[PDB]
Amino acid sequence: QYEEKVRPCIDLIDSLRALGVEQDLALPAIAVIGDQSSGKSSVLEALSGVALPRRCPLVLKLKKLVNEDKWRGKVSYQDYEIEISDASEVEKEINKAQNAIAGISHELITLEISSRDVPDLTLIDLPGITRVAVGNQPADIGYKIKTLIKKYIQRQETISLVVVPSNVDIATTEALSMAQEVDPEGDRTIGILTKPDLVDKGTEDKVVDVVRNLVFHLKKGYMIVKCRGQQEIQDQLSLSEALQREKIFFENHPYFRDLLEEGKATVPSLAEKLTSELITHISKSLPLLENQIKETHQRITEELQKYGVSDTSDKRKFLKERLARLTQARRRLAQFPG
Amino acid sequence: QYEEKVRPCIDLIDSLRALGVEQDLALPAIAVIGDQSSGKSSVLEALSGVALPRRCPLVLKLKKLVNEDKWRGKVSYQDYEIEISDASEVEKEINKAQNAIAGISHELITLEISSRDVPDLTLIDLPGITRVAVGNQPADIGYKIKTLIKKYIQRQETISLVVVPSNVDIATTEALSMAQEVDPEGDRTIGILTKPDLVDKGTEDKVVDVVRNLVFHLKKGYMIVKCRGQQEIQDQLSLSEALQREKIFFENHPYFRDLLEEGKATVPSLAEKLTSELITHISKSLPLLENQIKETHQRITEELQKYGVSDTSDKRKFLKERLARLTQARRRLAQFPG
């Protein structure tokens, strides 16, 4: 079925997030952030093994099958739950969901994939950061994207996964700037460098220094990947073939082979690191969660007194609904790991 | 000698800036700004035809020789004035100047080149923008660079020349963000896209749209150039040869040849546009300057009254020194165009 040494912790947080308690209770998360055109979408396709579009938070729940061989997919949003036929249908289903529910949206689309080709891993993908409004975006688009990202990354329970093209100085990216703002220590930020084939010749040593953690220091370090480029995406190059191309790319690179040899390159190595980091970050919360729920339930119970334990009726009700959700969270934690 | 139809206006502003009046009196300027690693230094080398390093404002005064054929160079900073032997010595002389005078410095290095290969053009190069401090830079490096840039670009008399690599979304660059902040209209901002050979295959149409002014609109528009890459800089490829490579690059490009045919590509076309824009921007100030000087002299004369017309002695003196400089500016304007 699954590896029941790794799944229970991951499933616990997934189920808590599925309750809707996260607005009120911080939950272990890896949030994927990047400036627009960072290539993070291609990284997400590579990790999930399926094509994706192409906005709002995408919860990617990946589950490693050690058994069936039989790919499974599911997309959930609002009151909808759709079984996905096969891998090729995911992109259509996500577009459908984005259209069904969507300014910048806070509504979650949850994509669950059970596959031999994916890691045990949950990620929260957040929309790419821009500085200036283009086209017909609202003028403060920068602010609205920042607000959504800040909601996740300001919490100590979130690791920021900062995605940056290999050609751009990491100290110039807004995504890293946002990460360093909430995590000055650099204790809960991982860097992923993408598009290494596009690096200007004679500047590869600078990229190596960055991945080796010599430039902007991060406790959890960096990885470098070569996912499908735009042409390959347009040719609908299969994701399995792109993994093969990636491997060859790093094995034959005059500068980046050293990064491969040091465990710092490729999607498969990245997947393994991300699973480990998630498990570590969940483990950090496990001993604390029970008191955290109690604390939160207490505070909200105090707010409930304000309405006296019509507009008053509804205010009472929405607070009761939040308290009920934290009670469900408490019960569900009490069941761990079953 | 020079083209005396174009020089007098350019020389006037140069001479006013050489007086030291700019802290007090806005002067027509084209300020070159970009995020770190934008390739603007290579653009400056291409325009000036000499190798440059490699910080503080570099005033690049370029003067088109229609006569001698005999390359001339001069570097001025503080109380120094150095005659440069030949083109190959410029980089050494600029490094010397940077060391002689230099946090982030506001001191000007003025480089004057008289050459058959340069346009009639003055530019003010400003240090590349970064978001996060690296190495041993002060924590607020972002703020100190912004402050220096803002001093120039907040003035309506400054055109911002925003330099951006062709691979990065222009709406993600800090430099454009700063430009749009002081020039929401986009009436005094020009965009230069660099490194077009590094564009991801299948994304060239997006670059074309940007240069064609279809994405982020600028009244004065965009140009695209292909200057020396890092390897070529390292091989010390001559700047004349790089111009040749550039021409071939655009003539043979499956997407960018259209940009060449539309007058939107290459350093020589860029030089011509920049000369025209500078002349236009100077012409805009010429009718206003006399009243602007009078206004400024008046206001400062009023401040001088505060000290009564030791620390008092010096305060009196520095205000007198500023007033004397504006008087010199008035006299020098009164001489125009001789």
XYZ file of C-alpha atoms in Angstrom:
676
model
C 0.000 0.000 0.000
C 2.095 2.927 1.403
C 5.122 3.181 3.678
C 3.357 3.355 7.066
C 6.495 4.702 8.743
C 6.320 7.923 6.718
C 2.603 8.337 5.871
C 0.997 8.733 9.321
C 2.611 12.122 10.161
C 2.045 13.461 6.665
C -1.545 12.194 6.623
C -2.208 13.793 10.008
C -1.316 17.299 8.809
C -3.134 16.735 5.471
C -6.270 15.712 7.411
C -5.952 18.709 9.706
C -5.635 21.025 6.694
C -8.642 19.235 5.151
C -10.668 20.203 8.252
C -10.250 23.911 7.475
C -8.487 24.678 10.761
C -5.401 26.254 9.196
C -6.753 29.856 9.225
C -6.756 29.477 12.989
C -4.003 26.956 13.690
C -0.517 26.891 12.120
C 0.225 23.529 10.431
C 3.539 22.155 9.170
C 3.862 23.257 5.518
C 6.373 23.559 2.711
C 5.213 26.607 0.676
C 6.638 26.897 -2.844
C 7.336 30.468 -3.813
C 9.085 32.214 -6.671
C 9.093 35.324 -8.783
C 7.053 35.010 -11.995
C 8.732 32.739 -14.584
C 10.909 31.060 -11.932
C 10.248 27.625 -13.481
C 8.594 26.362 -10.290
C 5.619 25.023 -12.208
C 7.983 22.742 -14.185
C 9.549 21.627 -10.873
C 6.057 20.729 -9.589
C 5.335 18.758 -12.764
C 8.646 16.902 -12.382
C 7.973 16.026 -8.717
C 4.352 14.963 -9.371
C 5.194 13.325 -12.712
C 2.163 14.963 -14.392
C 1.606 18.044 -16.561
C 0.087 21.051 -14.710
C -1.220 24.511 -15.643
C 0.395 26.611 -17.127
C -4.498 31.995 -9.295
C -4.581 30.248 -5.909
C -2.899 27.789 -3.550
C -2.416 24.284 -4.924
C -2.027 21.660 -2.198
C -0.098 18.894 -3.880
C -0.508 15.655 -1.829
C 1.833 13.064 -3.324
C 1.681 9.451 -2.122
C 4.340 6.843 -3.029
C 2.783 3.520 -4.078
C 4.867 0.515 -3.038
C 2.230 -1.878 -4.304
C -0.564 -1.484 -6.866
C 1.400 0.108 -9.737
C -1.987 1.650 -10.555
C -1.778 5.463 -10.862
C -4.600 7.277 -8.998
C -5.593 10.969 -8.950
C -8.114 13.180 -7.177
C -8.904 16.919 -7.205
C -10.914 18.597 -4.427
C -12.110 22.180 -4.145
C -15.024 23.686 -2.270
C -17.709 21.001 -2.219
C -16.330 19.196 -5.297
C -14.336 15.998 -5.396
C -13.286 14.631 -8.780
C -11.597 11.308 -9.518
C -9.032 11.807 -12.274
C -8.953 9.024 -14.912
C -5.219 9.120 -15.657
C -2.145 11.342 -15.503
C -2.938 13.201 -18.745
C -6.248 14.490 -17.289
C -4.747 16.361 -14.321
C -3.987 19.596 -16.182
C -7.605 19.766 -17.482
C -8.969 19.069 -13.968
C -6.828 21.786 -12.352
C -7.843 24.354 -14.982
C -11.462 23.314 -14.331
C -10.994 23.876 -10.588
C -9.281 27.262 -11.084
C -12.239 28.298 -13.263
C -14.821 26.870 -10.843
C -13.569 28.916 -7.857
C -11.831 31.886 -9.568
C -8.279 39.169 -7.730
C -5.942 36.661 -6.119
C -7.821 33.723 -4.518
C -7.165 32.123 -1.069
C -9.343 29.079 -1.878
C -7.361 25.814 -1.900
C -7.282 23.367 -4.789
C -6.129 20.009 -3.432
C -4.500 17.605 -5.861
C -3.888 14.095 -4.573
C -1.715 11.751 -6.663
C -0.977 8.117 -5.707
C 1.795 6.812 -7.947
C 4.953 4.681 -8.112
C 6.736 7.751 -9.523
C 6.108 10.361 -6.833
C 7.555 10.887 -3.335
C 5.551 10.875 -0.112
C 5.224 14.630 0.064
C 2.780 17.471 0.490
C 3.592 20.939 -0.838
C 1.581 24.181 -1.030
C 2.242 25.973 -4.300
C 1.639 29.725 -4.147
C 1.270 32.162 -7.046
C 4.415 33.690 -8.574
C 5.505 37.096 -7.341
C 5.435 40.169 -9.486
C 6.465 43.770 -8.688
C 4.583 45.700 -11.387
C 0.993 45.220 -12.617
C 0.697 44.223 -16.282
C -2.296 43.940 -18.596
C -5.450 44.194 -16.597
C -4.219 43.009 -13.224
C -5.253 45.231 -10.288
C -2.647 47.925 -9.476
C -1.834 46.424 -6.053
C -1.389 42.889 -7.418
C 2.049 42.826 -5.730
C 0.418 43.483 -2.338
C -2.332 40.864 -2.803
C 0.139 38.117 -3.780
C 2.443 39.129 -0.873
C -0.492 38.975 1.568
C -1.369 35.449 0.503
C 2.255 34.328 0.689
C 2.817 36.059 4.063
C -0.177 34.192 5.553
C 1.807 30.945 5.069
C 5.469 31.917 5.311
C 5.247 34.158 8.448
C 4.454 31.015 10.469
C 7.453 29.193 11.968
C 5.671 25.970 10.954
C 6.228 26.834 7.236
C 9.431 26.035 5.361
C 9.788 28.390 2.351
C 10.886 26.662 -0.815
C 12.300 29.537 -2.848
C 12.584 28.757 -6.581
C 14.990 30.834 -8.680
C 16.334 30.516 -12.240
C 20.085 29.826 -12.303
C 20.682 32.977 -14.402
C 19.306 35.389 -11.859
C 21.267 36.562 -8.789
C 19.466 35.072 -5.838
C 19.933 38.314 -3.877
C 17.764 40.116 -6.502
C 14.698 37.873 -6.245
C 11.682 39.063 -4.362
C 10.913 35.483 -3.177
C 14.209 35.246 -1.251
C 13.672 38.740 0.081
C 10.284 37.650 1.468
C 11.832 34.481 2.944
C 14.675 36.342 4.684
C 12.173 38.833 6.092
C 10.196 36.140 7.999
C 13.241 33.864 8.493
C 16.269 36.182 9.002
C 18.124 33.181 10.482
C 17.701 31.241 7.197
C 16.698 28.255 9.307
C 13.501 27.335 7.408
C 14.242 28.283 3.813
C 15.402 25.950 1.014
C 16.615 27.237 -2.381
C 15.939 25.496 -5.728
C 17.860 26.725 -8.753
C 16.217 25.950 -12.110
C 17.015 26.433 -15.837
C 20.765 25.667 -15.456
C 21.117 25.106 -19.214
C 20.417 28.822 -19.720
C 23.414 30.014 -17.638
C 25.746 32.472 -19.379
C 29.017 30.712 -20.289
C 31.805 31.734 -17.928
C 29.436 32.307 -15.009
C 28.858 28.647 -14.002
C 31.301 28.932 -11.063
C 28.999 31.562 -9.498
C 26.062 29.103 -9.710
C 28.135 26.296 -8.139
C 29.080 28.659 -5.254
C 25.398 29.430 -4.640
C 24.306 25.758 -4.578
C 27.256 24.906 -2.311
C 25.768 27.362 0.201
C 28.703 29.792 -0.085
C 26.847 32.941 -1.129
C 23.562 33.359 0.660
C 23.624 30.882 3.545
C 20.656 28.624 4.286
C 20.714 26.029 7.073
C 18.739 23.612 4.905
C 20.783 24.474 1.771
C 20.077 24.417 -1.955
C 19.300 22.053 -4.799
C 19.617 22.467 -8.576
C 17.347 20.856 -11.154
C 16.842 20.812 -14.910
C 13.127 20.281 -15.611
C 11.254 20.616 -18.903
C 11.998 23.835 -20.713
C 9.238 25.656 -22.552
C 9.872 23.923 -25.894
C 9.697 20.494 -24.195
C 6.497 21.568 -22.390
C 5.111 22.630 -25.782
C 6.160 19.304 -27.344
C 4.517 17.559 -24.381
C 7.776 15.712 -23.620
C 6.831 12.997 -21.160
C 7.887 13.676 -17.602
C 9.721 10.346 -17.366
C 11.819 11.315 -20.426
C 12.540 14.712 -18.907
C 13.910 12.919 -15.805
C 16.222 11.013 -18.154
C 17.337 14.185 -19.872
C 17.994 15.766 -16.468
C 20.256 12.917 -15.362
C 22.319 13.056 -18.577
C 22.447 16.846 -18.320
C 24.094 16.790 -14.879
C 26.327 13.732 -15.528
C 27.876 15.503 -18.546
C 28.045 19.091 -17.366
C 31.602 20.557 -17.048
C 30.656 22.488 -13.901
C 27.475 20.998 -12.559
C 28.546 17.322 -12.402
C 30.310 18.203 -9.126
C 26.957 19.382 -7.769
C 25.415 16.033 -8.744
C 28.313 14.172 -7.066
C 27.711 16.272 -3.925
C 24.003 15.260 -3.709
C 22.848 18.729 -4.699
C 21.271 18.013 -8.131
C 18.204 16.415 -9.809
C 14.480 16.020 -9.103
C 14.808 12.530 -7.536
C 17.389 13.802 -5.027
C 15.226 16.896 -4.485
C 12.156 14.691 -3.827
C 14.075 12.742 -1.216
C 15.284 15.937 0.487
C 11.754 17.462 0.507
C 10.223 14.298 2.038
C 12.934 14.365 4.766
C 12.448 18.092 5.428
C 8.664 17.749 5.648
C 8.962 14.804 8.062
C 11.394 16.807 10.174
C 9.175 19.857 10.213
C 6.067 17.808 11.097
C 7.975 15.987 13.862
C 8.874 19.381 15.315
C 5.167 20.238 15.687
C 3.884 16.876 16.914
C 4.796 17.393 20.624
C 3.374 20.961 20.613
C 0.114 20.615 18.680
C -2.091 19.484 21.530
C -1.302 22.584 23.625
C -1.494 24.798 20.533
C -5.017 23.581 19.771
C -6.032 24.087 23.432
C -4.581 27.636 23.397
C -6.360 28.530 20.177
C -9.694 27.018 21.295
C -9.444 28.999 24.571
C -8.774 32.350 22.882
C -11.645 31.856 20.387
C -13.935 30.686 23.214
C -13.210 34.026 24.884
C -14.228 35.883 21.678
C -17.453 33.889 21.616
C -18.389 35.473 25.005
C -18.635 38.881 23.259
C -21.848 37.775 21.501
C -23.300 36.408 24.745
C -22.984 32.758 25.814
C -29.276 38.539 13.809
C -25.916 39.780 12.612
C -25.214 38.695 16.221
C -26.696 35.269 15.452
C -24.375 34.701 12.472
C -21.280 36.037 14.300
C -22.032 33.587 17.121
C -22.443 30.782 14.557
C -19.192 31.349 12.591
C -17.239 31.347 15.872
C -19.001 28.127 16.889
C -18.068 26.673 13.482
C -14.403 27.577 14.064
C -14.498 26.042 17.572
C -16.154 22.882 16.240
C -13.296 22.607 13.686
C -10.655 22.886 16.425
C -12.544 20.229 18.417
C -12.421 17.956 15.331
C -8.679 18.756 15.175
C -8.202 17.792 18.827
C -10.118 14.515 18.281
C -8.151 13.748 15.139
C -4.848 14.364 16.914
C -6.027 12.110 19.757
C -6.288 9.314 17.140
C -2.669 9.639 15.923
C -1.158 7.581 14.372
C -4.303 5.517 13.600
C 35.886 68.863 -34.326
C 32.349 68.045 -33.006
C 28.833 68.507 -34.356
C 28.087 72.005 -33.002
C 24.353 71.531 -33.553
C 24.211 68.773 -30.930
C 27.116 69.547 -28.549
C 26.128 72.945 -27.098
C 23.044 71.706 -25.162
C 24.826 68.589 -23.963
C 27.921 70.578 -22.987
C 25.783 73.078 -21.081
C 24.303 70.431 -18.771
C 27.705 68.679 -18.425
C 29.259 72.015 -17.378
C 26.436 72.682 -14.941
C 26.900 69.224 -13.405
C 30.661 69.912 -13.284
C 29.914 73.000 -11.147
C 28.441 70.835 -8.377
C 25.018 72.496 -8.529
C 23.046 69.289 -9.068
C 22.406 68.599 -5.338
C 20.455 71.838 -5.408
C 19.228 72.127 -8.991
C 17.694 69.337 -11.108
C 19.591 68.840 -14.404
C 18.574 66.853 -17.483
C 19.925 63.304 -16.989
C 19.611 59.788 -18.335
C 20.242 57.513 -15.300
C 21.099 53.887 -16.089
C 19.597 51.491 -13.601
C 19.217 47.742 -13.331
C 19.045 44.872 -10.908
C 22.423 43.230 -10.223
C 23.693 41.187 -13.204
C 21.404 43.030 -15.645
C 24.238 43.286 -18.201
C 24.153 47.093 -18.106
C 27.905 47.295 -17.656
C 28.354 45.462 -20.993
C 25.876 47.911 -22.582
C 27.996 50.817 -21.273
C 31.150 49.230 -22.693
C 29.421 48.773 -26.062
C 28.211 52.403 -26.171
C 31.584 53.828 -25.048
C 33.589 51.301 -27.086
C 35.948 50.646 -24.137
C 36.218 47.987 -21.423
C 34.929 49.085 -17.972
C 34.862 47.634 -14.445
C 33.649 44.947 -13.719
C 30.323 51.584 -6.028
C 29.236 55.043 -7.204
C 27.800 57.143 -10.027
C 29.764 57.069 -13.274
C 29.099 60.095 -15.481
C 29.900 58.869 -18.953
C 30.445 61.910 -21.260
C 30.774 60.596 -24.809
C 31.779 62.961 -27.623
C 31.562 61.998 -31.327
C 34.695 63.015 -33.254
C 33.958 64.051 -36.837
C 37.564 65.025 -37.404
C 40.797 63.990 -35.669
C 40.342 60.192 -35.647
C 42.506 60.437 -32.522
C 40.869 58.713 -29.518
C 41.009 60.822 -26.314
C 40.069 59.959 -22.711
C 39.874 61.719 -19.356
C 38.814 60.686 -15.833
C 37.928 63.244 -13.141
C 37.045 62.700 -9.498
C 37.377 64.970 -6.496
C 40.404 67.156 -7.193
C 41.958 64.672 -9.652
C 42.009 64.879 -13.416
C 43.774 62.128 -15.351
C 44.454 61.986 -19.086
C 43.988 58.416 -20.296
C 46.632 57.217 -22.802
C 44.390 54.939 -24.872
C 41.177 52.921 -24.764
C 42.749 49.923 -22.993
C 43.689 52.099 -19.974
C 40.148 53.213 -19.088
C 39.252 50.177 -16.970
C 42.449 50.622 -14.875
C 41.731 54.365 -14.457
C 38.133 53.778 -13.321
C 39.207 51.124 -10.802
C 41.833 53.616 -9.579
C 39.152 56.292 -9.140
C 36.752 53.910 -7.347
C 39.603 53.030 -4.967
C 40.675 56.667 -4.534
C 37.222 57.840 -3.363
C 35.671 54.597 -2.005
C 28.966 51.925 2.112
C 27.513 53.141 -1.168
C 29.210 56.343 -2.428
C 27.506 59.477 -3.896
C 30.818 60.863 -5.228
C 30.863 61.163 -9.035
C 33.502 59.633 -11.280
C 33.394 61.465 -14.609
C 34.667 59.624 -17.663
C 35.043 61.689 -20.816
C 35.718 59.868 -24.105
C 36.246 61.649 -27.453
C 36.132 59.067 -30.233
C 34.937 58.326 -33.778
C 33.142 55.274 -32.343
C 30.929 56.819 -29.667
C 27.714 58.879 -29.826
C 27.310 62.413 -28.501
C 25.803 61.341 -25.213
C 26.039 61.729 -21.468
C 24.704 59.025 -19.153
C 24.810 58.571 -15.362
C 25.407 54.940 -14.467
C 24.107 53.970 -11.027
C 24.936 50.860 -8.996
C 22.923 47.677 -9.606
C 19.978 46.984 -7.335
C 19.895 44.135 -4.901
C 17.152 43.039 -2.463
C 19.151 40.938 0.014
C 22.572 41.664 1.562
C 25.280 39.135 0.674
C 28.807 38.636 1.978
C 29.783 41.567 4.092
C 27.536 44.238 2.637
C 25.639 46.303 5.238
C 22.178 44.860 6.041
C 20.334 47.869 4.565
C 22.332 47.830 1.315
C 18.996 47.744 -0.565
C 17.944 51.012 1.111
C 21.278 52.776 0.473
C 21.292 51.889 -3.245
C 17.597 52.912 -3.523
C 18.349 56.259 -1.841
C 21.102 57.040 -4.320
C 18.943 56.019 -7.273
C 15.893 57.927 -5.948
C 17.969 61.136 -5.705
C 18.266 61.047 -9.528
C 15.135 59.298 -10.774
C 12.547 61.168 -8.603
C 13.337 64.316 -10.615
C 11.182 64.903 -13.711
C 14.409 66.011 -15.427
C 15.736 62.392 -15.265
C 14.892 59.740 -17.848
C 15.311 56.252 -16.301
C 17.076 53.790 -18.545
C 15.975 50.458 -17.103
C 18.219 47.541 -18.144
C 16.807 44.011 -17.922
C 18.007 40.607 -19.168
C 15.712 39.169 -21.854
C 15.100 36.039 -19.728
C 13.582 37.860 -16.803
C 9.964 39.110 -16.746
C 10.217 42.865 -16.771
C 7.371 43.103 -14.237
C 9.585 41.235 -11.699
C 12.570 43.596 -11.803
C 13.106 46.032 -9.004
C 14.541 48.639 -11.444
C 11.246 48.874 -13.373
C 9.348 48.940 -10.107
C 11.421 51.955 -9.008
C 10.885 53.644 -12.396
C 7.098 53.164 -12.354
C 6.975 54.513 -8.803
C 8.463 57.922 -9.786
C 7.040 57.825 -13.345
C 3.618 56.084 -13.108
C 2.791 57.580 -16.531
C 5.784 55.760 -18.100
C 6.602 59.018 -19.860
C 10.316 59.181 -18.939
C 11.407 55.553 -18.805
C 13.187 53.586 -21.559
C 13.688 49.794 -21.399
C 16.807 47.962 -22.666
C 16.626 44.187 -22.928
C 20.008 42.419 -22.855
C 21.337 38.825 -23.145
C 18.825 37.780 -25.864
C 20.939 34.734 -26.764
C 20.094 33.278 -23.341
C 16.298 33.254 -23.915
C 14.570 29.912 -23.314
C 13.555 28.373 -26.665
C 9.823 28.732 -27.242
C 9.591 31.962 -25.249
C 11.026 34.370 -27.875
C 7.531 35.622 -28.828
C 7.119 36.963 -25.265
C 10.372 38.960 -25.650
C 9.257 40.366 -29.030
C 5.937 41.475 -27.431
C 7.839 43.308 -24.683
C 10.172 45.165 -27.089
C 7.197 46.053 -29.308
C 5.755 47.883 -26.286
C 2.796 45.487 -25.955
C 3.314 44.297 -22.383
C 4.429 47.053 -20.073
C 3.841 50.299 -21.965
C 6.491 53.021 -22.106
C 6.013 56.232 -24.098
C 9.674 56.182 -25.116
C 9.628 52.397 -25.757
C 12.248 49.656 -25.644
C 15.426 48.507 -27.336
C 17.151 45.108 -27.415
C 20.898 44.557 -27.627
C 23.388 41.699 -27.619
C 26.621 42.935 -26.008
C 29.643 40.918 -24.888
C 28.737 37.937 -22.771
C 30.916 36.967 -19.834
C 33.109 34.564 -21.831
C 33.771 37.282 -24.449
C 34.531 39.776 -21.647
C 36.951 37.202 -20.208
C 38.545 36.661 -23.639
C 38.790 40.450 -23.961
C 36.880 40.324 -27.270
C 37.342 43.747 -28.818
C 34.300 45.971 -28.625
C 34.333 46.571 -32.387
C 34.162 42.784 -32.966
C 31.318 42.491 -30.477
C 29.392 45.099 -32.527
C 29.924 42.846 -35.549
C 28.726 39.795 -33.675
C 25.658 41.740 -32.525
C 24.690 42.696 -36.075
C 24.993 39.097 -37.328
C 23.104 37.881 -34.262
C 20.035 40.017 -35.015
C 20.167 39.616 -38.834
C 20.008 35.813 -38.440
C 17.659 35.412 -35.504
C 14.344 33.592 -36.279
C 12.394 35.898 -33.954
C 14.521 38.931 -33.305
C 15.284 39.924 -36.926
C 11.816 41.535 -36.985
C 12.890 43.688 -34.039
C 15.983 44.770 -35.992
C 13.815 45.562 -39.049
C 11.553 47.652 -36.780
C 14.475 49.813 -35.511
C 14.330 48.246 -32.066
C 17.682 46.365 -31.987
C 21.477 46.899 -31.683
C 23.865 49.249 -29.866
C 24.275 51.660 -32.826
C 20.494 52.141 -33.072
C 20.358 52.410 -29.269
C 23.103 55.090 -29.315
C 21.136 57.109 -31.835
C 17.935 56.828 -29.775
C 19.735 57.832 -26.529
C 21.328 60.907 -28.175
C 17.859 61.947 -29.473
C 16.202 61.355 -26.087
C 18.883 63.311 -24.224
C 18.599 66.236 -26.663
C 14.829 66.191 -26.248
C 15.034 66.086 -22.483
C 17.611 68.912 -22.364
C 15.509 71.016 -24.763
C 12.579 70.592 -22.380
C 14.597 72.206 -19.562
C 16.273 74.993 -21.531
C 13.318 77.464 -21.382
C 12.766 76.784 -17.643
C 16.293 76.739 -16.215
C 16.729 80.458 -15.723
C 13.643 80.717 -13.479
C 14.553 77.452 -11.745
C 17.986 78.801 -10.811
C 16.415 82.077 -9.589
C 13.869 80.131 -7.486
C 16.541 77.930 -5.953
C 18.911 80.852 -5.249
C 16.025 82.725 -3.549
C 15.045 79.829 -1.274
C 18.681 79.204 -0.222
C 19.206 82.955 0.284
C 16.300 82.805 2.734
C 18.011 79.936 4.633
C 21.178 82.014 4.802
C 19.236 84.641 6.851
C 18.905 82.075 9.685
C 22.632 82.429 10.472
C 22.420 86.230 10.371
C 23.188 88.294 7.254
C 31.844 79.056 14.794
C 29.619 76.154 13.847
C 27.567 79.214 12.789
C 30.534 80.468 10.752
C 30.832 77.207 8.787
C 27.048 76.878 8.260
C 27.055 80.417 6.845
C 30.011 79.500 4.603
C 28.590 76.257 3.114
C 25.372 78.109 2.221
C 27.440 80.881 0.625
C 29.339 78.193 -1.315
C 26.045 76.747 -2.598
C 24.805 80.234 -3.584
C 28.096 81.004 -5.340
C 27.648 77.752 -7.340
C 24.130 78.756 -8.423
C 25.492 82.183 -9.420
C 28.136 80.410 -11.559
C 25.249 78.359 -13.017
C 23.277 81.509 -13.847
C 26.359 83.082 -15.502
C 27.083 79.913 -17.443
C 23.497 79.712 -18.683
C 23.706 83.384 -19.694
C 26.582 82.354 -22.017
C 24.586 79.656 -23.865
C 25.297 78.464 -26.511
C 28.839 79.947 -26.490
